[PDB]
């Protein structure tokens, strides 16, 4: 029943975005996706997909690569040239997806932390980090108050006196 | 056959939406580059951390 953030797990119920908010207040529990940080991560992954095919490989008349007869020296060199090429490109492909996947995991992890810190900044001295990805907001925060946090218009001076009294 | 494909191999035409290819080192046209791997999976999403009870 109690809600928990990203430190512990992910949310299978979230389908309208990649990152989002869950809250529990006097009116009940709710969920909402954060679209800007969802698209900020998607924009980067789209950019990767664009850069991996951005260069066209267009080859026409090349060398012969299969042979029906034993010839010796020249054919040895033709086979060696093609095998060398394939091994180098096979290496380039293996390193590329490894580097890209490491960066994709990093950038998506970063978008989560940026949304958490962005929220931490808004709340200032009116909330505390519970340590599981959630904030304990020390004042009455109705649905309209939660939405002000989600859309970045929350004014901390309004609830500051109330929140400081509950914290201490 | 009656179709459209920029890339031709002795095995037949192949599309070129992927950067690499494992069908045949003999190609003609705008083709993916030939590699030895049969599959390379590029992540298009974040780490999947299924939820707790």
């Amino acid at each position, epitope marked *: 029943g109690a809600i928990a953030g990203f430190i512990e797990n992910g949310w299978e119920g979230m389908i309208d975005g990649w990152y989002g908010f869950r809250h529990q207040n006097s009116e009940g529990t709710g969920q909402a996706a954060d679209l800007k940080s969802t698209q900020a991560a*998607i924009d980067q*992954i789209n950019g990767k*997909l664009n850069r991996v095919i951005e260069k*066209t490989n*267009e080859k026409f008349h090349q060398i012969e690569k299969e042979f029906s007869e034993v010839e010796g020296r020249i054919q040895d060199l033709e086979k060696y040239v093609e095998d060398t090429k394939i091994d180098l490109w096979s290496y380039n492909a293996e390193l590329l997806v490894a580097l890209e996947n490491q960066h994709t995991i990093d950038l998506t992890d970063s978008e989560m932390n940026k949304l958490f810190e962005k929220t931490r900044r808004q709340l200032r001295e009116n909330a505390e980090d519970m340590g599981n990805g959630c904030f304990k907001i020390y004042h009455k925060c109705d649905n309209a108050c939660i939405e002000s946090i989600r859309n970045g218009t929350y004014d901390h001076d309004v609830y500051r006196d109330e929140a400081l009294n509950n914290r201490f | 056959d009656t179709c*459209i494909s*920029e890339c031709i191999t002795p095995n037949g035409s192949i599309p070129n939406d992927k950067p690499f290819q494992n069908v045949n080192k003999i190609t003609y046209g705008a083709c993916p580059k030939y590699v030895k791997q049969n599959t390379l999976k590029l992540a298009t999403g974040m780490r999947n951390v299924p939820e707790k009870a």
Partner: antibody, heavy 128, light 108 residues
Framework: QVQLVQSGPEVKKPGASVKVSCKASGYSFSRYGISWVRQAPGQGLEWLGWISGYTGNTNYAQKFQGRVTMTTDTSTSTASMELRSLRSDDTAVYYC?????????????????????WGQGTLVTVSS | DIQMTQSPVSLSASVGDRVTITCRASQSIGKFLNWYQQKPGRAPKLLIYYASNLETGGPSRFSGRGSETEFSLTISSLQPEDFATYYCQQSNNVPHTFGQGTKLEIKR
């Protein structure tokens, strides 16, 4: 039929502002964006900018920075374009077009980085 | 900005003819090039997207080719409906830019 329907024609005196709206139907308006393109009479097509129906993010051509504001409204599925400080050479037929899929990773051949469909057009005449 | 150059500026051909329009970018745009057909007095309409893909409605006599810097549009057997103006357009970088158009008219 996926469709963009634009507001009626406008006649404006120099120095005024014009606001043109595009109403979408037949598709998920919040999962795409809208690009605005204008065409002066007997001329070619010129890109003004783009706004996302998902985020509200905007891209303006440097030529129009400070003069254009694009807005999107999810509930009415309507995108708007406002051009300020109009001049005589702002006279054109203004088009909107659905552009760029949002909210999901897309391969290039499925990115919808192309203008389709188009609105019917909005004629804006700027003359004193 | 990236510049798009279309050739020829104008072209006259007969019904059943085979024609080819050319579009050129000042720098590489990948395959993010689109083609639009505009009939006089009407809004532009998408014909080819991502260099070579026919919009699902589209007639099979239109075909697109090219990548990077050089692109083409081909009509294998010209029909009366095909005589209009054709614009190529680049979607790789903002700001998106159009070619100046190729007007296709009937020979007589």
């Amino acid at each position: 039929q996926v469709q963009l329907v634009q507001s009626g024609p406008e006649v404006k005196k120099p120095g005024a502002s014009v606001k043109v709206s595009c109403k979408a139907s037949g598709y998920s308006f919040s999962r795409y964006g809208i690009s605005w393109v204008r065409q002066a009479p007997g001329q070619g097509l010129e890109w003004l900018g783009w706004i996302s129906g998902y985020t509200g993010n905007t891209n303006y051509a440097q030529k129009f920075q400070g003069r254009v504001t694009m807005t999107t409204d999810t509930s009415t599925s309507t995108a708007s374009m406002e051009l300020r400080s109009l001049r005589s050479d702002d006279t054109a037929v203004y088009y909107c077009a659905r552009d760029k899929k949002q909210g999901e990773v897309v391969l290039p051949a499925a990115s919808f980085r192309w203008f389709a469909p188009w609105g019917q057009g909005t004629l804006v005449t700027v003359s004193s | 900005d990236i510049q798009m150059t279309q050739s020829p500026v104008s072209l006259s051909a007969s019904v059943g003819d085979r024609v080819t329009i050319t579009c050129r970018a000042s720098q590489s745009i990948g395959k993010f090039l689109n083609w639009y057909q505009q009939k006089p007095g009407r809004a532009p309409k998408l014909l080819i997207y991502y260099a070579s893909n026919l919009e699902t409605g589209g007639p099979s006599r239109f075909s697109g080719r090219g990548s990077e810097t050089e692109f083409s549009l081909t009509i294998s057997s010209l029909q009366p409906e095909d005589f209009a103006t054709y614009y190529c357009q680049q979607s790789n970088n903002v700001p998106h830019t159009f070619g100046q158009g190729t007007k296709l008219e009937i020979k007589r």
